[PDB]
Design a protein. Structure first.
Lengths: 153, 153
C-alpha cells in the first residue's frame, strides 16, 4: 500500500501539469512518500525532483483512497494526498523522465485527457480551498467504476 | 504499515478522552482504517464504536508519520490522522474495551499522563485551526527521541 502525493500549482491563472509519454494522460506532478517523511516533506521533495520547481507553501486539500476493483473484490489500494500551491520558485525543466511539463490554462484543464477521478479532484481543488475526502474505485485498466466524494460535487 | 485516525472533540471547554486500563496513558478516541474507506468515514465509525458518540463535522488537522526507532534503524512506521470537532450527538459509553471515557477540561489536558508526541499534537490542535504536519521518532517503549513539526511549536 503506497502513499502518493501530488501538487496543483496555480500561478497567473495557469496550472503546472505533466503529460505521460505517447500522448498519454495528464497528471499533477508529485511522487511516493519515503519512510520517515511527513506528507509535507514528500511533496516538496518529489515535486522538485520532477519539475525543478520549489513550491513555497503547499497546503493539503485532498485525501483519497484509490481502489483497484476486480472480479467483485478489492485487489489493490493506495492513498493519494493532493496539495495546492500558489507561490513557487525555480525554472521549469523541459523534460521529466515521466513526461513533458507544461503550464496549462486553468479553464482548459478539465478538457484534457485524464483518469476520470482526477477530473473530479481538479474540479473541486481548482475552485475551492475546502478539504476534499474521497474514494475512487477503478478497474485494472483505470476505468472509473464509482466514487464517494465529501463534500459532494 | 497501518493507518490510525482519532478525533479531538471540544465541547464547551471540555475534551473527550480515553484512559487506558491500569491508570495508563490518556488518548483521543479513534481507530484503524478498513480497506476501501476514506479517512473521514473511518474516524466517524471508529469514534462511534469506541464512544457511543456521533461526531458531526470532524475536520482533519494533523497528519503524522509515527516511527519506532531501534538499533539505529527505523523498525516500524505508521500514520496518524487527527481530526477536530465541536458538535456531536449521542450518549457517551461508561466503559469501552480500550478503557475509561471521560470529558476533561481543556486547560488540564496537557497535564494528563500521555505519550510525549501527543502533547505537541494536543498543544497545537486544542488552540489552533491550522493544519499540523509532522514525524515523531519513538523507542520501542515510546520514549520520544525527536520530532519535526510544521508549523513548529
Amino acid at each position: 500500500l503506497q502513499r502518493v502525493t501530488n501538487c496543483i500549482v496555480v500561478d497567473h491563472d495557469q496550472v503546472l501539469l505533466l503529460q505521460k509519454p505517447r500522448r498519454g494522460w495528464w497528471v499533477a506532478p508529485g511522487g511516493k512518500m519515503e519512510a520517515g517523511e511527513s506528507i509535507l516533506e514528500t511533496v516538496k521533495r518529489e515535486y522538485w525532483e520532477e519539475t525543478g520547481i520549489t513550491v513555497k507553501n503547499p497546503e493539503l486539500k485532498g485525501i483519497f483512497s484509490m481502489v483497484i476493483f476486480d472480479e467483485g473484490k478489492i485487489v489493490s489500494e493506495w492513498m493519494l494526498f493532493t496539495f495546492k500551491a500558489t507561490e513557487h520558485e525555480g525554472e521549469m525543466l523541459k523534460q521529466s523522465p515521466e513526461g513533458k511539463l507544461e503550464w496549462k490554462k486553468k479553464d482548459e484543464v478539465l478538457e484534457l485527457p485524464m483518469a476520470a477521478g482526477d477530473k473530479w479532484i481538479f474540479k473541486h481543488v481548482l475552485h475551492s480551498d475546502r478539504l476534499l475526502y474521497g474514494t475512487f474505485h477503478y478497474t485494472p485498466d483505470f476505468e472509473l467504476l464509482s466514487y464517494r466524494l465529501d463534500p459532494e460535487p
